[PDB]
C-alpha cells in the first residue's frame, strides 16, 4: 500500500508514534517519505552485504527481521520480514519503536540523518490534524 501523506500521519499517531522516544510525528513522516515514499511493500536488496531493507521504514534484515537468507543475521523485532510488507503497518511500527530504543535513536536510519536531521520537517504533518 502507498499511503497518502495525512492518511499516514493519522495512522502513525493512532499507533502511538507521536513523541515515541522523543521523536515527533513529523520526523517519522520524514523518515517514511525518504525511505519508501510511504510504500509498505518497498524492498531494497543490498548486494554488498546480502541484506534486504523491508517496508515503509526500510528496516534491515541483518538485524531486525528474519528472511532466512541474510548470512549470520539476527531478528531483534522477532518477526518474519514479511510482517514488514503488510498494508497494515502495526508490526512495522512496533519494529520501528524497537529500532529507536537502541543507542542511536532516530539516527539509526542514515536517510533520516541525510534528509531530516536539522531540517524543517513541519511540512510533513501540516494540515493532517495531528
From Swiss-Prot:
Lysozyme C is capable of both hydrolysis and transglycosylation; it also shows a slight esterase activity. It acts rapidly on both peptide-substituted and unsubstituted peptidoglycan, and slowly on chitin oligosaccharides. Residues 1-130 form the C-type lysozyme domain. Keywords: Amyloid, Amyloidosis, Antimicrobial, Bacteriolytic enzyme, Disease variant, Disulfide bond, Glycosidase, Hydrolase, Secreted, Signal. PANTHER family: LYSOZYME C (PTHR11407:SF28). The active site is at residues 35, 53. It comes from the Eukaryota. CDD domains: LYZ_C. This is Lysozyme C. Disulfide bonds join 6-128, 30-116, 65-81, 77-95. Its EC number is 3.2.1.17. PROSITE patterns: GLYCOSYL_HYDROL_F22_1 (PS00128), GLYCOSYL_HYDROL_F22_2 (PS51348). GO terms for molecular function: identical protein binding; lysozyme activity. It catalyses: Hydrolysis of (1->4)-beta-linkages between N-acetylmuramic acid and N-acetyl-D-glucosamine residues in a peptidoglycan and between N-acetyl-D-glucosamine residues in chitodextrins. The gene is LYZ. It is found in: Secreted. Monomer. Its main location: secreted. It holds the Pfam family Lys. One of its GO terms (biological process) is defense response to Gram-positive bacterium. GO terms for cellular component: azurophil granule lumen; extracellular exosome; extracellular region; extracellular space; specific granule lumen; tertiary granule lumen. Lysozymes have primarily a bacteriolytic function; those in tissues and body fluids are associated with the monocyte-macrophage system and enhance the activity of immunoagents. Belongs to the glycosyl hydrolase 22 family. It is linked to Amyloidosis, hereditary systemic 5: A form of hereditary systemic amyloidosis, a disorder characterized by amyloid deposition in multiple tissues resulting in a wide clinical spectrum. AMYLD5 primarily affects the viscera, and the predominant clinical features are renal dysfunction of varying severity, and intra-abdominal bleeding. Inheritance is autosomal dominant.
Amino acid at each position: 500500500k502507498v499511503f497518502e501523506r495525512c492518511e499516514l500521519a493519522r495512522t502513525l499517531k493512532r499507533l502511538g508514534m507521536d513523541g515515541y522516544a522523543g521523536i515527533s510525528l513529523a520526523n517519522w513522516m520524514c523518515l517514511a517519505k525518504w525511505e519508501s515514499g510511504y510504500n509498505t511493500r518497498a524492498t531494497n536488496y543490498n548486494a554488498g552485504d546480502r541484506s534486504t531493507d523491508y517496508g515503509i521504514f526500510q528496516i534491515n534484515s541483518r538485524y531486525w527481521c528474519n528472511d532466512g537468507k541474510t548470512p549470520g543475521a539476527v531478528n531483534a523485532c522477532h518477526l518474519s520480514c514479511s510482517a514488514l510488507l503488510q498494508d497494515n503497518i502495526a508490526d512495522a511500527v512496533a519494529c520501528a519503536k524497537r529500532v529507536v530504543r537502541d543507542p542511536q535513536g532516530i539516527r539509526a536510519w542514515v536517510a533520516w540523518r541525510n534528509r531530516c536531521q536539522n531540517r524543517d520537517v513541519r511540512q510533513y504533518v501540516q494540515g493532517c490534524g495531528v
